[PDB]
Amino acid sequence: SGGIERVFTDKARYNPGDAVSIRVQAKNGTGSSWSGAARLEIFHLENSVYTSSQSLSLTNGQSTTLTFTWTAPSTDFRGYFVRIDAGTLGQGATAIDVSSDFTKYPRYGYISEFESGETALESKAKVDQLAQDYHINAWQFYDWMWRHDKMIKRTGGSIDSTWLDLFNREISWSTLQNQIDAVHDVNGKAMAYAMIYASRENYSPLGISPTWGIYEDSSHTNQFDVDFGDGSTYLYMFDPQNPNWQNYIHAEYIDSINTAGFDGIHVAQMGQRSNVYDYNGNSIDLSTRFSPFLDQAKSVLSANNPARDNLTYNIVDGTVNGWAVNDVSKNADLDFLYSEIWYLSDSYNQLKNYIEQLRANGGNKAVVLAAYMNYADNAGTRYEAESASMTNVSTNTNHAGYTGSGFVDQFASTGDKVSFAINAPEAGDYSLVFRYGNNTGANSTLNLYVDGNFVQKLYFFNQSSWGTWKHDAWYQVPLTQGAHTVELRYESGNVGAVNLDSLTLGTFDEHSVRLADAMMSASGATHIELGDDNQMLPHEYYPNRSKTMRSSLKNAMKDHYNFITAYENLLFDSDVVPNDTGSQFVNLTGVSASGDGSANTVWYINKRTSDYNIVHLINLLGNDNQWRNTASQPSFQTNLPAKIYIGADETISDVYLASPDLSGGETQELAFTSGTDAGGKYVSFTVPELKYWNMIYMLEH
Numbered sequence: 001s002g003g004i005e006r007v008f009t010d011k012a013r014y015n016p017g018d019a020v021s022i023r024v025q026a027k028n029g030t031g032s033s034w035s036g037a038a039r040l041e042i043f044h045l046e047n048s049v050y051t052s053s054q055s056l057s058l059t060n061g062q063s064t065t066l067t068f069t070w071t072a073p074s075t076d077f078r079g080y081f082v083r084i085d086a087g088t089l090g091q092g093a094t095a096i097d098v099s100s101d102f103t104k105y106p107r108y109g110y111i112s113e114f115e116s117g118e119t120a121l122e123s124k125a126k127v128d129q130l131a132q133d134y135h136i137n138a139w140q141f142y143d144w145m146w147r148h149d150k151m152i153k154r155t156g157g158s159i160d161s162t163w164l165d166l167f168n169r170e171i172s173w174s175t176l177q178n179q180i181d182a183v184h185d186v187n188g189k190a191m192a193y194a195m196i197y198a199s200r201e202n203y204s205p206l207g208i209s210p211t212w213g214i215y216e217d218s219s220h221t222n223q224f225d226v227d228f229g230d231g232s233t234y235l236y237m238f239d240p241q242n243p244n245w246q247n248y249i250h251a252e253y254i255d256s257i258n259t260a261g262f263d264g265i266h267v268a269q270m271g272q273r274s275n276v277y278d279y280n281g282n283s284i285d286l287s288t289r290f291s292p293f294l295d296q297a298k299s300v301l302s303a304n305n306p307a308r309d310n311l312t313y314n315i316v317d318g319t320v321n322g323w324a325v326n327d328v329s330k331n332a333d334l335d336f337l338y339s340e341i342w343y344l345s346d347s348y349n350q351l352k353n354y355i356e357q358l359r360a361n362g363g364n365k366a367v368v369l370a371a372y373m374n375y376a377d378n379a380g381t382r383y384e385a386e387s388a389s390m391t392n393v394s395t396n397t398n399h400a401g402y403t404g405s406g407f408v409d410q411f412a413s414t415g416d417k418v419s420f421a422i423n424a425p426e427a428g429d430y431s432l433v434f435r436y437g438n439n440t441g442a443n444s445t446l447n448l449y450v451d452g453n454f455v456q457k458l459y460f461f462n463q464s465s466w467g468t469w470k471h472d473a474w475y476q477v478p479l480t481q482g483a484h485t486v487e488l489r490y491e492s493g494n495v496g497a498v499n500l501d502s503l504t505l506g507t508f509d510e511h512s513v514r515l516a517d518a519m520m521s522a523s524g525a526t527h528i529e530l531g532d533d534n535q536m537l538p539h540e541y542y543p544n545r546s547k548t549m550r551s552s553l554k555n556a557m558k559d560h561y562n563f564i565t566a567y568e569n570l571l572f573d574s575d576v577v578p579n580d581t582g583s584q585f586v587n588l589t590g591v592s593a594s595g596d597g598s599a600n601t602v603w604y605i606n607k608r609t610s611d612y613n614i615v616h617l618i619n620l621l622g623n624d625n626q627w628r629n630t631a632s633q634p635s636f637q638t639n640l641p642a643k644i645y646i647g648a649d650e651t652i653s654d655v656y657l658a659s660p661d662l663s664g665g666e667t668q669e670l671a672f673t674s675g676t677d678a679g680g681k682y683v684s685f686t687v688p689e690l691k692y693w694n695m696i697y698m699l700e701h
């Protein structure tokens, strides 16, 4: 098997003029010798712009790697599709982005691990995989810093080679510096995460004054804080418009750029706080105070280094006219916009409208969303704990909300054990996720053994009652294909007790993820969801690996990111705008349609540039209108008729459709007819295949 195994480029973005080196990795699986050619074609949208061929002979079972050189055309900010054809050996694809500045088309990843064991080679590997497979061109470095108010730890004037972060992880300077070097190698940019307004506890001896702080009340009595739950460890919050706090923390931003080599600062925040005072007791609206900080930030960064002055800011809890949404997106000197969605834009449609507001408020600046998929779902293959092998503990049913036929109780003493026999369909990482109850008044622990080896002590959090199930006890392990044993053991020095409901191989649901990303991108945004060593982002604490992508979803992602890179001019460009105004329409014979992402339908979103009329179809057949929750496989459709009404205005030369779902997102020309109905001007064609997302672009001349 295989054929064309990988297609990718040495770097994630290129400048105009750069030599671009397309690699193609091929392997003959057909138990025979093979001789033929591999043909390279590169398109800018509908138009072929380079073609080339190389002869290829391979014995039975032989692998090789071809290289095709290309030069990036001098028009800046253009994306290209890439096809490789090898006849009977197979085909493949990738995409190329020619853009001098990543902030126009951000494809944002992350890094959250900085382990000392990590070699420069491993660091390059993780960066290289994301850059090659998805064209990630910027990375958010998460929880790299020592302290929030002192990001680089020094002993005298000497940088400490390792340090411990607020959750006691060991951060390595050299690992960090290697990863940054690697990001740069692929023409990546590196964004340091940093708060706008946070110090850590016991701040006064770092010369920070409480008089710079924000307060819950007007007697300067309680400083807004963030409590990490151990009585020691806190963030304290400060006034973004205070000139001393700006002075202090912008000097840290700069230290970070200049010492670590970052290309900018990803500024975070906690979200909405109400009834906010300064030290002196003047009531203040915290939501208008971020962009004066950000303006000042931008200006001291651009003065320090125009090449490394990138800036974004987390608009937390995003939604149409959400807190700080308007002030930030309209008045902050940010290179691009960023927003963490929680529960105010739960429908595909609501989230579309938020993206549109953002894109409109910012002057078609790029928007990136953080939106952790399947966040509330225990998604993946479930193994009931009542159906496993348990010792000195028995099943029960006497507390509601379990899955299956019950759960294992009284898992409270030495020698108690539960063994699950699981199958791993493919070698890879697996998130072992346990659903459980704990009402002992504290944290509870068990020891986790895989195939007879201990792997980690595991914490089970205390809860409001034994009626209440959580599933935030997990650990991620590598596994070979085939059978394995996963075992929890109550041993010596384990504490508390738990009811165990089940084990789950925490898995992102391909269906929901494909839909969510098509929506986001048709709407005009990107999604930060990939990082470290091909992990997908399950939670706001980025080191969290309670879900894993299986290979089926990895491939769809490679397709998705190929797609949004080749078609970035049609998806993201400065002049790409909705057609919401007017009153347009689309008809699909056989299937319901909607313009507002209604449940169990197909969804048209109509957009335009001056060159093209664009309609995205997104297949919500068989699924609700919520973007985040898991979903069923939608009803794929074949040879489906459509008619798109337009205006008396438009004349349409050709019709084109590309989809990540089909031939890796290559563009097909479609046959079609024109004319007029009672409803108005119209055009018509058969959509050969709709799976999750088709984009229809129709050339207007």
Ligand SMILES: OC[C@H]1O[C@H](OC[C@H]2O[C@H](OC[C@H]3O[C@H](OC[C@H]4O[C@@H](O)[C@H](O)[C@@H](O)[C@@H]4O)[C@H](O)[C@@H](O)[C@@H]3O)[C@H](O)[C@@H](O)[C@@H]2O)[C@H](O)[C@@H](O)[C@@H]1O
Residues within 6 Å of the ligand: 143, 195, 268, 269, 270, 314, 316, 340, 370, 472, 539, 540, 541, 542, 544
């Ligand atoms: O205690 C059990 C708990 O453990 C893990 O979660 C840990 C916590 O993650 C988050 O808080 C840590 C986070 O706090 C600040 O950032 C918050 C937030 O900032 C936003 O702007 C940004 O978009 C987010 O990415 C970021 O999380 C600090 O600035 C940051 O340095 C620090 O990393 C979360 O808010 C807390 O709720 C969690 O306790 C497990 O992953 C989890 O399952 C478990 O419940």
Ligand SMILES: OC[C@H]1O[C@H](OC[C@H]2O[C@H](OC[C@H]3O[C@H](OC[C@H]4O[C@H](O)[C@H](O)[C@@H](O)[C@@H]4O)[C@H](O)[C@@H](O)[C@@H]3O)[C@H](O)[C@@H](O)[C@@H]2O)[C@H](O)[C@@H](O)[C@@H]1O
Residues within 6 Å of the ligand: 399, 409, 410, 411, 412, 439, 440, 466, 496, 497, 498, 499
């Ligand atoms: O302060 C005294 C102790 O308090 C805590 O003890 C908690 C218990 O932990 C385990 O039980 C887990 C179990 O808890 C409930 O059962 C409550 C009672 O219900 C029945 O009467 C049962 O037959 C009794 O044994 C039990 O007391 C849940 O309903 C059940 O689903 C859970 O699995 C131990 O088995 C108990 O002996 C503990 O009391 C705290 O953990 C201790 O430190 C304190 O000693």
Ligand SMILES: [Ca+2]
Residues within 6 Å of the ligand: 384, 385, 386, 402, 403, 404, 405, 406, 407, 500, 501, 502
């Ligand atoms: Ca169960």
Ligand code: NA
Residues within 6 Å of the ligand: 512, 623, 624, 625, 626, 627, 628, 629, 630, 631
């Ligand atoms: Na859904």
